[PDB]
Ligand binder design. Structure first.
Ligand code: SF4
Ligand code: SF4
Lengths: 371, 367
């Protein structure tokens, strides 16, 4: 109950657990375009968009909220209508214009580079003036223009979090502040609304519900429904993975909101922890690690001996950072994570895996660095 | 319905679908030791065993059939009793001796190297004579001593690689009675491996496939004196290709006529994938046979649906790492069970090939 640690955890929670309208492929392009502040989008003589291949190879199949269209073209058009102050929710409240899409289709040129996250926007208008944007590395790292949005978690606050143990997260889920309780309740509500039908259902059993509900929420997001998702560390998929299996497991079990809240928070805490300790398919390795720990708390309580067994079994049955199948193969990856996390609660491991939760998170983090 | 196709397929079915007693980790050590032909195992002054790390990190937790012990020590002791003519099945009919294990424990020295498959055995006896064995690269590639090598031919294998899924679908309609008995044997042999609950979480079709496949897998791992019908010398690959289809049939129509066709189709696809690739790999090739086999039982010879099942399974391909501790292998098969079953309910648009042959080559490229 360090109180100083409570202050650290709560700042990390408000900085990483945030809303996002649409996938961050289209959300990033829209926000980068929106930062140019083109007063009259019909004045654009030419527009160049510079994206990395890691964000290009998937944006073609992602639907843009409030447009009824899919791909990069409506993400840029949407950006020209949305407000830069909305950040990741740039597509919110936009009134789509087909006349603008027809005008922009002609002047839009896309350059693709092989590098980490990069999203540059260069615009030249009829008057001869030029405009520039640049979001690099992190989904909210705005390089151009200069925006003194001072609070973002600095390196010391991040390093202090990486040094925490599972025992601290187990103590925190008892001493929860009311803002964090409302943030967790918001997360549970936001991602619950994403469930809109059957995507991969094969029964009424607990596992098939987790798979169906997690994949339905995942699909709803990817098709471009005007519904925000509560993302964890800027990843909408990682927030879905960390929450939906626990929401669906609660529904199929006690239906205890008090327990659901603690388990969802524990899961989110573990997810951010793994993300911080990781290097450059982390959705299911980091998100699924939060899910397996969260499900283990609901099913066993604060039994460290059983929480450590769940982490070793999950790490042994690691899905595979493949990712390669665009999106929809993205939902299949979440479904696989659902299976790995649920099955890990019924097997105990006696090599390639660590001894405890902290050792396993570092082993996963090592796999993502070299491979 | 070419007559030359029936000839090559049947000759390959009898060459790849064979029995196996214990995991090929322990089976390899036993066979390599057995090739030294130590007339009196109690005459051994010293023994050195040279294994690669890819086979050492497994063998400590693997049980040796007919010994009631686990590990390298009883695999070497068992090898000193078994016949080199038994090959991979060297542990069959052995009468374990604790007195020999006590004597050998003292003189056994293990050297571990970081290289592809290697299993060398050097022995020096009380009389001053020396003996040597060496199996490297393939589980049956005996380098030392020089053997006849017998029929697995390069022209025949290449002819099978060039075949299409259409040939395997035609073959499951004109099956020879020896192949029908071989498939029936496979279904029976691997069904007997199911010995309890390993990973059960319900009564549903999927949880049955997972539980039965992992229980069968575990039985083999613990060294029970029960052979398993391996596919291309892999017991795990043989389990993966058959158990989900045996457990799906049990939970569905319980049709032995369709079970045989589906099991054969699965085995055919497994050998095909194995031939197409070099150098985890049981669930990618064995699970590909399982997904095609399950798709035939559920949809028949619908090529449009068989191609969709292959693309979905290739998209949802399990982990690349070979799970250690041997316990991790049961978990890998369980994951393959999930990937194969779930692939029959999702269709993929547009990595990921267009048809079954393209997907097998994509998997082969990853390995
Ligand atoms: S495959 Fe995994 S890492 Fe890649 S986008 Fe989908 S969930 Fe994220
Ligand atoms: S982890 Fe995969 S490749 Fe390795 S032994 Fe197990 S099934 Fe075979």
């Amino acid at each position: 109950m360090d109180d100083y640690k409570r202050i650290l955890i709560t700042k990390i929670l408000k900085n990483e657990v945030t809303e996002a309208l649409g996938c961050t492929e289209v959300g990033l392009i829209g926000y980068a375009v929106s930062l140019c502040n083109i007063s009259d989008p019909f004045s654009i003589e030419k527009i160049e968009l510079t994206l990395n291949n890691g964000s290009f190879k998937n944006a073609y199949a992602v639907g843009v909220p409030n447009t009824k269209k899919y791909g990069i073209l409506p993400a840029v058009v949407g950006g020209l209508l949305g407000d830069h102050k909305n950040k990741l929710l740039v597509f919110n409240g936009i009134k789509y214009s087909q006349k603008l899409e027809d005008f922009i289709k002609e002047r839009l040129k896309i350059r693709v580079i092989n590098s980490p996250l990069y999203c540059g926007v260069k615009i030249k208008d009829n008057s001869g003036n030029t405009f520039e944007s640049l979001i690099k590395d992190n989904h909210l790292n705005v390089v151009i223009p200069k925006i003194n949005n001072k609070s973002e978690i600095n390196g010391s606050e991040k390093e202090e979090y990486k040094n925490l143990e599972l025992l601290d997260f187990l103590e925190y889920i008892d001493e929860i502040p009311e803002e964090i309780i409302q943030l967790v309740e918001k997360t549970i509500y936001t991602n619950n609304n994403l469930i809109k039908g059957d995507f991969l259902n094969f029964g009424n059993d607990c596992l098939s519900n987790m798979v169906n509900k997690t994949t339905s929420a995942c699909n709803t997001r990817m098709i471009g429904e005007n519904m925000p998702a509560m993302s964890v560390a800027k990843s909408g998929n990682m927030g879905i993975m960390a929450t939906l299996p626990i929401i669906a497991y609660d529904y199929s079990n006690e239906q205890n909101q008090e327990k659901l809240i603690k388990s969802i928070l524990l899961s989110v805490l573990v997810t951010i922890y793994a993300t911080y300790k990781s290097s450059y398919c982390g959705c299911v390795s980091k998100g699924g690690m939060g899910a397996v720990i969260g499900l283990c708390y609901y099913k066993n309580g604060k039994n460290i001996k059983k929480l450590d067994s769940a982490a070793r079994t999950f790490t042994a049955n690691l899905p595979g950072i493949i990712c390669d199948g665009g999106k929809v193969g993205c939902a299949l990856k979440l479904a696989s994570g659902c299976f790995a996390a649920y099955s890990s609660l019924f097997v105990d491991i006696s090599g390639i895996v660590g001894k405890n939760f902290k050792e396993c998170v570092e082993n996963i983090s090592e796999i993502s660095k070299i491979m």
